[PDB]
Swiss-Prot record, chain A:
Protein's recorded name: E3 ubiquitin-protein ligase RBX1
Known EC number: 2.3.2.27, 2.3.2.32
First and last residues shown, out of full length: 21 to 108 of 108
Gene Ontology BP annotations: cellular response to amino acid stimulus; cellular response to chemical stress; cellular response to oxidative stress; cellular response to UV; DNA damage response; MAPK cascade; negative regulation of canonical Wnt signaling pathway; negative regulation of insulin receptor signaling pathway
Phenotypic consequence of C43A: Strong reduction in ligase activity
UniProtKB/Swiss-Prot annotation, chain C:
Subcellular location: Cytoplasm
Range of the intact protein held here: 475 to 504 of 2517
Tissue/organ expression: Ubiquitously expressed in all tissues with highest expression in testis brain and kidney.
Function as written in the Swiss-Prot or TrEMBL entry: Core component of a Cul9-RING ubiquitin-protein ligase complex composed of CUL9 and RBX1. The CUL9-RBX1 complex mediates ubiquitination and subsequent degradation of BIRC5 and is required to maintain microtubule dynamics and genome integrity. Acts downstream of the 3M complex, which inhibits the ubiquitination of BIRC5. The CUL9-RBX1 complex also mediates mono-ubiquitination of p53/TP53. Acts as a cytoplasmic anchor protein in p53/TP53-associated protein complex. Regulates the subcellular localization of p53/TP53 and its subsequent function.
Family membership noted in the UniProt record: Belongs to the cullin family.
Superkingdom of source: Eukaryota
Protein's UniProt name: Cullin-9
PTM notes: Neddylated. Neddylation is mediated by E1 enzyme UBA3-NAE1 complex and E2 enzyme UBE2F. Structural rearrangment of the C-terminal TRIAD/RBR supradomain may play a role in neddylation and deneddylation.
Originating species: Homo sapiens (Human)
Length: 76, 72, 19
């Protein structure tokens, strides 16, 4: 016979417009509703530069995934 | 390699070995040190996120213990 | 988180009727 002394198990947390201002993803910015370009970040979300400018000026985390927002500068 | 096109494919390949290495051994000093050297090469910062994931999981273990106590 | 024990949960109507 065998006996278990320890163990480790694994599982995944299985579960798209500009959520922060809720306008359509490709549409314009409600605050100004037309000069906001879209912004991308390392955490792979797309938000309005207006939305993000304000929000970041308030708080310094990604509002969608709880990580320090980093303006994506690859490929640029 | 940083800032070039090859970064994405290198990172894709690196993830695939860092996975098995973390499941075979806990996140040692070695992985964190190598990353503190070559981190800015990885464009999306996936490996750092795997490492941080292990730590978040230990925190969750603490909270689960407390929750059991409250139920009892 | 232990819940607030006091927060969690007619005679006056009757008395009104009697009166």
């Amino acid at each position: 016979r065998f006996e278990v002394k320890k163990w480790n198990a694994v599982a995944l947390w299985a579960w798209d417009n500009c959520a922060i201002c809720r306008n359509h993803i490709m549409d314009l910015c409600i605050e100004c509703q037309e000069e906001c370009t879209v912004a991308w970040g390392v955490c792979n979300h797309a938000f309005h530069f207006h939305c993000i400018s304000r929000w970041l000026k308030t708080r310094q985390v990604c509002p969608l995934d709880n990580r320090e927002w980093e303006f994506q500068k690859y490929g640029h | 390699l940083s800032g070039l096109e090859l970064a994405t494919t290198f990172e894709h390949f690196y993830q695939h070995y860092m996975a098995d290495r973390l499941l075979s051994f806990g996140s040692s000093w070695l992985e964190g040190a190598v990353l503190e050297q070559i981190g800015l090469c990885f464009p999306n910062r996936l490996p750092q996120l795997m490492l941080q994931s292990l730590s978040t999981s230990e925190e969750l273990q603490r909270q689960f213990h407390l929750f059991q106590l409250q139920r009892l | 988180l232990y819940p607030l024990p006091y927060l969690q949960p007619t005679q006056a109507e009757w008395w009104e009727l009697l009166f």
